Design a protein around this nucleic acid. Structure first.
Lengths: 180, 27, 127, 86, 286
RNA sequence: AAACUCACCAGGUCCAGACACAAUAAGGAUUGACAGAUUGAGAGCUCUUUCUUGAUUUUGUGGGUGGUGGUGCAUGGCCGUUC
């Protein structure tokens, strides 16, 4: 189920059609999260929403409000009322693209990266990092149909991702009390 | 070069001998 | 205006004659051989004055070299000329005399010696 | 609506990877613009090391976020809330 | 020559390490392998040889595999990158580069401060570089000693520029928009400033250090004020400084009388007006 | 040092389906000693508008025969290199 959608949350028994924001339920040291749009089919998810709060850590049941099966519920998923916290904060990621057009040594001519000239020139303040993690900064670029000129650990290939950074922050969504 | 190296710097087209300026004291 | 001497003498000259009075680095060009590359240019010129609002502005017909010499005869037509990529619109007049069409070029985003702002884009921000 | 559970079921369960791999890729056709869509928010270094915050001053804050009981911590008020009943 | 572009791949893994190992390579030259973790209290195998293999290519450290006395050394960038890192640590340098200027053990590196006005990171590397047993020992301490001997007339009423920090080779000198005496063309008050060259060494004998070394690059008519051109003096005359006890002042005192007689006369054909002064007064009036 | 050199650039196209069977396959699929349109910033090429064609080969396709992709991994002598 896509995870920007109203799911009827129970944390315990009572029902509210809340509009959550699921994020990855990994072991988080810094307690800093994501605005992950949608779901992952196995692991733990961490919702983020506004609810009118019943503060006793229940096994949460999230479902769809219909008498679909012989159960009068469509059970979407069980989990844990983790907390109610303001400083449990989000950061949506980006991964941009770099498709290396050749096999160079130091300066890699990358195309399929930047079309427009004011999208070439003004967007030269973005940190260059490879999908392998080779961080760095843009020193030049000229490409039109978008190049660069930087210095990384080794060499690059046409199946690599010379990514760039947009780490943006969307904002959460409130509940809806469903009783019927 | 003569096939026992990957020699890419100081290349030679002069006089067919394929021995570098850096290879008068090697080759 | 070509020399100051009579204008009904000078305008339709080819690559032959006065340069045999001129010195041999620009005599071993213009008094050897006409190089008739502007001869079928007249045949496209004679249509580049017909269907205009006349005497004023014809169309920017493109031309992509750097050692080709235009002759003044053709008062009232427009040709777009090589500047490295694009085609500078020239209303062709007797106001260019034996100098290159491909001299219309200073091809750089300008040399930053007074405002060095693109040099600031190559330096090191550092973690 | 069951037809769009075969029409849009092509996408509205398989766009779940638009979150994962290309989350906020400025996607590039010659018609799509780069400036306008992903414009109005920071770009720090690393999610396990950076610094994002709680209460900015924007219209992006919803109704019972900027009219909150701003919960301090849960774990540092569950002792309060439960011990209000203990 | 120079490398600069082998630094920005790190994390916190080297920031706790540095001045613990910089005060640890001084307490204990060439450091063996399992000590980078344990001088800094960094843990044994939580992102560790990943980070040391990250440091390995960067030439601020090198894998000196000797026979059980291994080497991890904080090549020449163990001073150079890590003093850039030190000025990132001692709150002066925020990134690297708007820099133009060339010497031998003094490169002028034009920077902008924490404030915003510019200054200059001069760097000390003698022998070019030759950085060895005393060459590192010099550029560590000649950055520290000449942090102590650029205030000998600033307190006493005269013009010596001020040093700011002494990080490992780096000496930061405002920045001075000078005009040396080979760049200038004309002057408005000529005969004052010839007799003030007898009189500057008069000022130098008050502090007890006579300076001599005057070539055509020396006396900067600088830019304190840009618009109204309230200029000043930068006197690059320092390194011919001699303790007067030594037996060479027989021809240092006579330099103060009959050796400056060419430049205001010839450079500025205009035969000069003024008087002069000796330094026999300054022997007693210190 | 000239355009080439000369490792880069401002704009275009000669050209990709073989091997099987599947649509048309010899009423023109696709072939050529030629006549024009030919031009993209200056070209050879094509065969809709003479006619060689000669069974053969045209294409939405995948194993991959096509390693004229070898960077190679070392393996086998052989000599720059290390002694």
């Amino acid at each position: 189920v896509p995870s920007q959608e109203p799911i009827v949350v129970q944390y315990g028994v009572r029902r509210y059609t809340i509009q959550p924001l699921f994020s990855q339920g990994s072991n988080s040291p810094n307690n800093v999260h994501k605005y992950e749009r949608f779901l992952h089919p196995d692991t733990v998810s961490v919702a983020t929403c506004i609810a009118p709060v019943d503060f006793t850590q229940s096994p949460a049941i999230f479902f769809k409000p219909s008498p679909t099966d012989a159960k009068n519920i469509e059970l979407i998923g069980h989990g844990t009322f983790l907390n109610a916290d303001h400083s449990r904060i989000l950061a949506k990621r980006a991964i941009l693209t770099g498709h290396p057009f050749r096999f160079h040594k130091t300066v890699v001519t990358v195309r399929y990266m930047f079309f427009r000239p004011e999208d070439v020139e003004w967007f030269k303040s973005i940190p260059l990092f490879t999908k392998s993690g080779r961080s760095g900064f843009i020193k030049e670029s000229l490409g039109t149909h978008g190049y660069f000129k930087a210095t990384f650990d080794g060499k690059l290939s046409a199946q690599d991702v010379v990514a760039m950074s947009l780490y943006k922050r969307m904002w959460p969504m409130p509940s809806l009390p469903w009783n019927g | 070069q003569c096939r026992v190296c990957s020699s890419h710097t100081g290349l030679i087209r002069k006089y067919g001998l394929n021995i570098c300026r850096q290879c008068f004291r090697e080759k | 205006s070509y020399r100051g001497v009579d204008l009904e003498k000078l305008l339709e000259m080819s690559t032959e004659d006065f340069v045999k009075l001129a010195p041999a680095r620009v005599r071993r060009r213009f008094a050897r051989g006409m190089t008739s590359k502007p001869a079928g240019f007249m045949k496209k010129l004679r249509a580049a004055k017909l269907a205009a609002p006349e005497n004023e502005k014809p169309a920017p017909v493109r031309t992509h070299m750097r050692n080709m010499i235009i002759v003044p005869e053709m008062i009232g037509s427009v040709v777009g000329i090589y500047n490295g990529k694009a085609f500078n619109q020239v209303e062709i007049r007797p106001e260019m005399l034996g100098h290159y069409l491909g001299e219309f070029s200073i091809t750089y985003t300008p040399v930053r010696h007074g405002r060095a702002g693109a040099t600031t884009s190559r330096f090191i921000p550092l973690k | 609506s069951p037809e769009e559970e075969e029409r849009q079921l092509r996408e509205f369960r398989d766009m779940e990877k638009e979150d994962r791999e290309f989350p906020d890729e400025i996607e590039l056709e010659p018609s799509e613009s780069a400036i306008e869509r992903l414009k109005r928010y920071r770009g720090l270094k690393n999610l396990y090391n950076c610094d994002w915050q709680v209460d900015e001053k924007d219209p992006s804050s919803p109704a019972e976020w900027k009219r909150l009981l701003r919960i301090g911590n849960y774990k540092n008020t569950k002792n309060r809330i439960i011990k209000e009943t203990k | 020559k120079l490398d600069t572009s082998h630094m920005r791949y790190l994390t916190t893994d080297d920031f706790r390490v540095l001045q613990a190992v910089e005060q640890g390579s001084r307490s204990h030259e060439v450091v063996p392998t399992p000590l980078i973790h344990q001088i800094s209290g960094m843990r044994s195998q939580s992102g560790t040889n990943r980070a040391i293999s990250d440091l390995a290519k960067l030439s601020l450290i090198s894998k000196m595999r000797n026979v059980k006395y291994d080497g991890y050394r904080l090549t020449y960038n163990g001073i150079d990158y890590l003093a850039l890192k030190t000025m990132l640590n001692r709150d002066t340098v925020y990134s690297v580069g708007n820099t133009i200027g060339v010497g031998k053990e003094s490169d002028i590196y034009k920077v902008s401060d924490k404030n915003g006005n510019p200054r200059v990171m001069k760097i000390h590397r003698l022998g070019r570089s030759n950085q060895g047993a005393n060459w590192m020992h010099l550029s560590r301490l000649a950055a520290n000693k000449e942090y102590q001997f650029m205030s000998m007339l600033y307190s006493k009423g005269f013009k010596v520029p001020e040093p700011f920090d002494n990080s490992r080779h780096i000496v930061v000198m405002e920045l001075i928009e000078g005009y040396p005496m080979r760049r200038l063309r004309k002057h408005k008050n000529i005969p004052k400033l010839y007799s003030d060259l007898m009189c500057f060494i008069v000022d130098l004998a008050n502090s007890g250090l006579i300076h001599c070394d005057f070539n055509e690059f020396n006396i900067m008519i600088k830019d304190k004020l840009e618009d109204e051109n309230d200029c000043g003096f930068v006197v690059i005359d320092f390194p011919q400084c001699i303790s007067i006890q030594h037996q060479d002042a027989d021809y240092y005192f006579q330099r103060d009388v009959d050796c400056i007689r060419r430049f205001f006369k010839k450079k500025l054909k205009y035969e000069p007006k003024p008087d002069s002064s000796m330094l026999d007064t300054e022997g007693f009036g210190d």
